[PDB]
Amino acid sequence: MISILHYGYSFIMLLGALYFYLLSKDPKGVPASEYLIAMVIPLWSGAAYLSIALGQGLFQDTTIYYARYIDWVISTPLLLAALALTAMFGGKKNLTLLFSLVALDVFMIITGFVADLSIGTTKYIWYSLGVIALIIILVITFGPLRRIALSNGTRLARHYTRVAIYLSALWVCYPTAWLLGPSGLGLAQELTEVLVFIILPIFSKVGFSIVDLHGLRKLHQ
Amino acid sequence: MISILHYGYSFIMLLGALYFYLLSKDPKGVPASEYLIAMVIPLWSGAAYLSIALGQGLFQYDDTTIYYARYIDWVISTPLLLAALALTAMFGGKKNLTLLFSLVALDVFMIITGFVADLSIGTTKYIWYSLGVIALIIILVITFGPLRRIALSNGTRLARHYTRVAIYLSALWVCYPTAWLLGPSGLGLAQELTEVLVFIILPIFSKVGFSIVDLHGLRKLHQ
Amino acid sequence: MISILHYGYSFIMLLGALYFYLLSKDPKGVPASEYLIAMVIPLWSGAAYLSIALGQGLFQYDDTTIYYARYIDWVISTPLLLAALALTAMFGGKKNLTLLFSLVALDVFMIITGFVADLSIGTTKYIWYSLGVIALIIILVITFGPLRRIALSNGTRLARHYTRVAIYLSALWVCYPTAWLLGPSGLGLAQELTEVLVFIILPIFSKVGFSIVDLHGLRKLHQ
Ligand SMILES: CCCCCCCC/C=C/CCCCCCCC(=O)O
Ligand SMILES: CCCCCCCC/C=C/CCCCCCCC(=O)O
Ligand SMILES: CCCCCCCC/C=C/CCCCCCCC(=O)O
Numbered sequence A: 001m002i003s004i005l006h007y008g009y010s011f012i013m014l015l016g017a018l019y020f021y022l023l024s025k026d027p028k029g030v031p032a033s034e035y036l037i038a039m040v041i042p043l044w045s046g047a048a049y050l051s052i053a054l055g056q057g058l059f060q061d062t063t064i065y066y067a068r069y070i071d072w073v074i075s076t077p078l079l080l081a082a083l084a085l086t087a088m089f090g091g092k093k094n095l096t097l098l099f100s101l102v103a104l105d106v107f108m109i110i111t112g113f114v115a116d117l118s119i120g121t122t123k124y125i126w127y128s129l130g131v132i133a134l135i136i137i138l139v140i141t142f143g144p145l146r147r148i149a150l151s152n153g154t155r156l157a158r159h160y161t162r163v164a165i166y167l168s169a170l171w172v173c174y175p176t177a178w179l180l181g182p183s184g185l186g187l188a189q190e191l192t193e194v195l196v197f198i199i200l201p202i203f204s205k206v207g208f209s210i211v212d213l214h215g216l217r218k219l220h221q
Numbered sequence B, C: 001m002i003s004i005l006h007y008g009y010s011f012i013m014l015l016g017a018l019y020f021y022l023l024s025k026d027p028k029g030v031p032a033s034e035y036l037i038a039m040v041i042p043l044w045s046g047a048a049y050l051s052i053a054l055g056q057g058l059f060q061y062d063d064t065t066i067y068y069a070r071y072i073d074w075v076i077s078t079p080l081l082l083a084a085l086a087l088t089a090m091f092g093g094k095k096n097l098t099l100l101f102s103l104v105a106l107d108v109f110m111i112i113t114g115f116v117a118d119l120s121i122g123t124t125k126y127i128w129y130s131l132g133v134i135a136l137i138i139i140l141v142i143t144f145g146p147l148r149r150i151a152l153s154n155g156t157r158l159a160r161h162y163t164r165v166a167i168y169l170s171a172l173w174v175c176y177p178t179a180w181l182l183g184p185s186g187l188g189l190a191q192e193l194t195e196v197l198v199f200i201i202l203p204i205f206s207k208v209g210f211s212i213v214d215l216h217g218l219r220k221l222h223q
Helices: A002-025 A032-053 A067-087 A095-117 A121-142 A144-150 A154-171 A173-180 A190-218 B002-025 B032-053 B069-089 B097-119 B123-144 B146-152 B156-173 B175-182 B192-220 C002-025 C032-053 C069-089 C097-119 C123-144 C146-152 C156-173 C175-182 C192-220
Strands: B059-061 B064-066 C059-061 C064-066
Touching: A002 A032, A002 A190, A032 A067, A032 A190, A032 B097, A067 A095, A067 A144, A067 A154, A067 A190, A095 A121, A095 A144, A095 A173, A095 C032, A121 A144, A121 A154, A121 A173, A144 A154, A154 A173, A154 A190, A173 A190, B002 B032, B002 B192, B032 B069, B032 B192, B032 C097, B069 B097, B069 B146, B069 B156, B069 B192, B097 B123, B097 B146, B123 B146, B123 B156, B123 B175, B146 B156, B156 B175, B156 B192, B175 B192, C002 C032, C002 C192, C032 C069, C032 C192, C069 C097, C069 C146, C069 C156, C069 C192, C097 C123, C097 C146, C123 C146, C123 C156, C123 C175, C146 C156, C156 C175, C156 C192, C175 C192
Parallel strands: none
Antiparallel strands: B059 B064, C059 C064
């Protein structure tokens, strides 16, 4: 079941990438860079999850799905870039604020991988550093980045706020599931955690980019 | 023999880098970035192949030898080669960084699929191999499609030089997956020693040769 | 003692990052990018050294201890330090990103050669070590040659500050390969505990100290 679910994930990621490619042919005032980012995220995630389907992306008395971290270390910074470029749509880019989010995010993902390889108290030291990183990313998202979106007009700011809430809501689920599942307290079963880390990324990657790009295309008229 | 051939490779790469450094002192209207890229490619490749000569850049997986240092080489050197090609098409005009980074993304994936294919057994090997080939096909479509159209927009002389260098690179690049498949990593029709000679001779033309043809053409547009 | 010293290091790095964050709120004409670089360096180094304190960032290779977390630290922190230096020379003038990326390329290679040297036995160790030293020499040539000439082109006050920071960095940086060679990784004339103290004290001056001297100088060109 685990293998079949991961094949199904990869196929949906492929269809997502094709959809974003088609949209890019009629860009409706959205820069090509934003279409490219929306295509890379699902293609990279699909390839990583494919490695799990074929039984290569994990190792073993607990099973670590390391391919998830290889996915997230590329896909999550690109998602924060898409969010930041949304706030900055039609105005000056602030690359310092963008790269601050990339730096925080990559650290967050590495702390999670190390936490998964750790035993005892040490696991929860690393986990905690990752959570603090996520908190600061959320403060930036709803503080200075939202202020940039407001400075680009009410229509843009409204779309930014919607996409920020969408992403923020899905992102807090990852560390929660991690903690309740085998990697943490083990209150939830392996099969449960797998279903969560199949369904969340579908909404997190393909869903987010549909909502994000349609909103920006609608500002062309 | 295998060790000595890799020492010889590294020494030729060093001489290549020194030659490009000298050329950079009299740049003849070619930006410094293009000289830097031409120097990094052979220096990085030389260091990787040196690790093979010293017997560090390989290990034994079941009954086969994996030359993993090749992948450490190619993951840096091949994206820089596609950048040099893209900057050639864009010479005297606006840079399109989105198209450049699309080629880098495709290329890095292509090289990773090859490394994983080399570590795989049975059908799984050929799934990864196949994904890498599709990546290479899309790179070739970009090279002869949108990137060639950018070269045309920068004038007849430049477009002619671009087309020559693109064919040169395209011809050498299709040899890598072919050799991979016929050698030990694939069907095993060719011996280890054969594959080694191929992955010594091809990179010399692919790295140092390509950059000589590429840079001399661009320097000739100054006069 | 080794574990306690690494906790103390991480805590000092945290306080360094906080100080640079406060300074960034009243930037005094220094771009936000230079404050961000000064914050990333100590935070990344602190996290790496924390992994040593918890006993995860090292392993036993043959009969010696490799502190591999140091290399994970330096491969991110040292290129960012050379970037801060380069941006100091270029303060109030055109950025030369080709010269900046040349320093990053040299530096990353230098750090990788060190990691491979630490994993090597016999002559091979000293081949890799030597390639890293040559990289450091070329970085020093750039620092006191073309990069210092850019600083002079941005005026006497800036050039004076650049020269001070360049000497400060150059002085600390030559200590790393010296200590490496005298300690367990090399000839073994110095004890593990000695080497540890050196690779706790030097980075404090190398990271937090350098950025204090660097940023205060640039802020003073505003007053
Ligand atoms: C923690 C893991 C590694 C993270 C490294 C990320 C690098 C951080 C530094 C980036 C510099 C940002 C450059 C921005 C330039 C434009 C400045 C602006 O106009 O805002
Ligand atoms: C498989 C791993 C891939 C990692 C690299 C992914 C890169 C994606 C990001 C693209 C950045 C595009 C730069 C945009 C610059 C706009 C100006 C222009 O295009 O001329
Ligand atoms: C050993 C690993 C090497 C990885 C780093 C690769 C460095 C090569 C890239 C060069 C980019 C050049 C910078 C762009 C030039 C902009 C114009 C300018 O200001 O000079």
